[PDB]
Design a binder for this molecule. Structure first.
Ligand SMILES: CNC(=O)N1CCN(C(=O)c2ccc(COc3ccccc3)o2)CC1
Length: 121
């Protein structure tokens, strides 16, 4: 299964599934600073799933590993901003992270396998 380009549509489909998840709603668009005035005191690099989708559609990811790094930043930002492990929004982040990691593992494996096949000779 050695298509070097297949990851892109696989990531578009997984982002579609993430946007159907009620657990993604807090992570779809940027944090408003009027509502969370200290957010940028804690978070140096904001990230959200609309920014991930637009970067993909612009042709500004070279690999699914780069997309995976930005999605993982969404979740680490939630973990750093939460005042407790038991917050609503951080609890939604943990379920959505488990869903994402379950689905991205084959996308990464197939891509890396396809690159190794390309360089086999
Ligand atoms: C459009 N998206 C946003 O505005 N976001 C809000 C901030 N955020 C977080 O990841 C996060 C982690 C924990 C919390 C809030 O915790 C509370 C704790 C007790 C009472 C009320 C809230 O927010 C990203 C999504």
């Amino acid at each position: 299964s050695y298509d070097i380009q297949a990851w892109k549509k696989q990531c578009e489909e997984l982002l579609n599934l993430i946007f159907q998840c009620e657990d993604s709603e807090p992570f779809r668009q940027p944090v408003d600073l009027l509502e969370y005035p200290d957010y940028r005191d804690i978070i140096d690099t904001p990230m959200d799933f609309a920014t991930v989708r637009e970067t993909l559609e612009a042709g500004n990811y070279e690999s699914p590993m780069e997309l995976c790094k930005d999605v993982r930043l969404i979740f680490s930002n939630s973990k750093a901003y939460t005042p407790s492990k038991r917050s609503r929004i951080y609890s939604m982040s943990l379920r959505l992270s488990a869903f994402f990691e379950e689905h991205i593992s084959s996308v990464l494996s197939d891509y890396k396998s396809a690159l190794r096949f390309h360089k086999r000779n």
